[PDB]
């Protein structure tokens, strides 16, 4: 019993090519270049899925430090006081209160200040 | 019952290892990976190194043979009387070759441990111990002659 390659090799190829669309040049038309670029893309995606955390942490931290420096202290003093006050509150992100409702942010500044020392 | 599932009772799996793929036995395919993995290794059974084999041993096994070679001679087949004790009456090489223990080795010769039955027995030879154990039970004639 013989079995040619048949549909198979095309189907598989087509599948990979389906992801390739959007890419520049042969890299999206040719199966081979498509495969390679898809590999690199997969790895980049996996890595940046961890990068996203660091990036957002940093952005938040900058904003927090800015609005905190509006009141008189720096981010280091802020977190020292806040963690010393007992408020394990606010996954740093939720200090977005710098933007909306900055009054709450100010009361938090005080509660950190007095409990700092 | 019908051809829907006489299927082999879940152990015989013909799953021969197909090594050509991208996962399982990729690229190098089967245990190879190096070189002199191509046509075929030299033996290895008895052979190789190119030194001296284990061939340093020696033939004490004399009488390996002459040109006319094998000298035909009456080959003696032994038989314990404990396997003979399975049945009883009066045995001859015919009965022993019929039972299963003889296989036309022809020259019969009872011997050995086990226990003796008082029955009679024709053979071609008799071991001492067997002759005595059977002497304490029954009678026994010697060979024909040839």
């Amino acid at each position: 019993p013989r079995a040619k390659t048949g549909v198979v090799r095309r189907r598989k190829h087509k599948k990979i090519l389906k992801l390739a669309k959007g890419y520049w040049g042969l890299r999206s038309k040719s199966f081979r270049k498509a495969r390679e670029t898809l590999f690199a893309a997969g790895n980049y995606a996996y890595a940046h899925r961890k990068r996203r955390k660091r990036d957002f942490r940093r952005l938040w931290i900058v904003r927090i430090n800015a609005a905190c420096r509006q009141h008189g202290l720096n981010y280091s003093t802020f977190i020292h006081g806040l963690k010393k006050a007992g408020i394990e509150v606010d996954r740093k992100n939720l200090a977005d209160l710098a933007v909306r409702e900055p009054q709450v942010f100010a009361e938090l500044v005080e509660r950190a200040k007095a409990a700092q020392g | 019952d019908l051809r829907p599932n006489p299927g082999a009772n879940k152990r015989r799996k013909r799953v021969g290892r197909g090594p050509g793929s991208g996962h399982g036995k990729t690229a190098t395919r089967g245990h190879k990976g190096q070189k002199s993995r191509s046509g075929g290794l030299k033996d290895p059974r008895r052979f190789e190194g190119g030194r001296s084999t284990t061939l340093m041993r020696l033939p004490k096994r004399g009488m390996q043979g002459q040109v006319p070679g094998e000298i035909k001679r009456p080959r003696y087949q032994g038989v314990n009387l404990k396997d003979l004790a399975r049945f009883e009456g009066e045995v001859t090489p015919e009965l022993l070759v019929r039972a299963g223990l003889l296989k036309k080795g022809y020259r019969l010769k009872i011997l050995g441990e086990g226990e003796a039955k008082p029955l009679k027995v024709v053979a071609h030879a008799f071991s001492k111990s067997a002759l005595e154990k059977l002497k304490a039970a029954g009678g026994e004639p010697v060979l024909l002659e040839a």
Binding site: - | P44, R45, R46, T54, L55, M56, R57, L58, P59, K60, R61, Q64
Partner: protein, 63 residues
């Protein structure tokens, strides 16, 4: 097709009733000149092997 036995092997090696392989003690034919009587007795006997022992079996087996 149909493995021929290794004639060299059988002419110089005996397979045990259990499974081991037996050969004669080497060093008792050419090296003698005034070697002690201790030698020629201990070299007169036969002995086992080890892992080439397992190789040997393959070289027979119709035997």
């Amino acid at each position: 097709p149909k493995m021929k036995t290794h004639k060299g092997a059988k002419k110089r090696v005996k397979i045990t009733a259990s499974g081991k392989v037996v050969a004669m003690k080497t060093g008792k034919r050419h090296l003698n000149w005034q070697k002690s009587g201790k030698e020629i007795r201990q070299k007169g006997r036969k002995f086992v092997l080890a892992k080439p022992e397992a190789e040997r079996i393959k070289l027979l087996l119709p035997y």
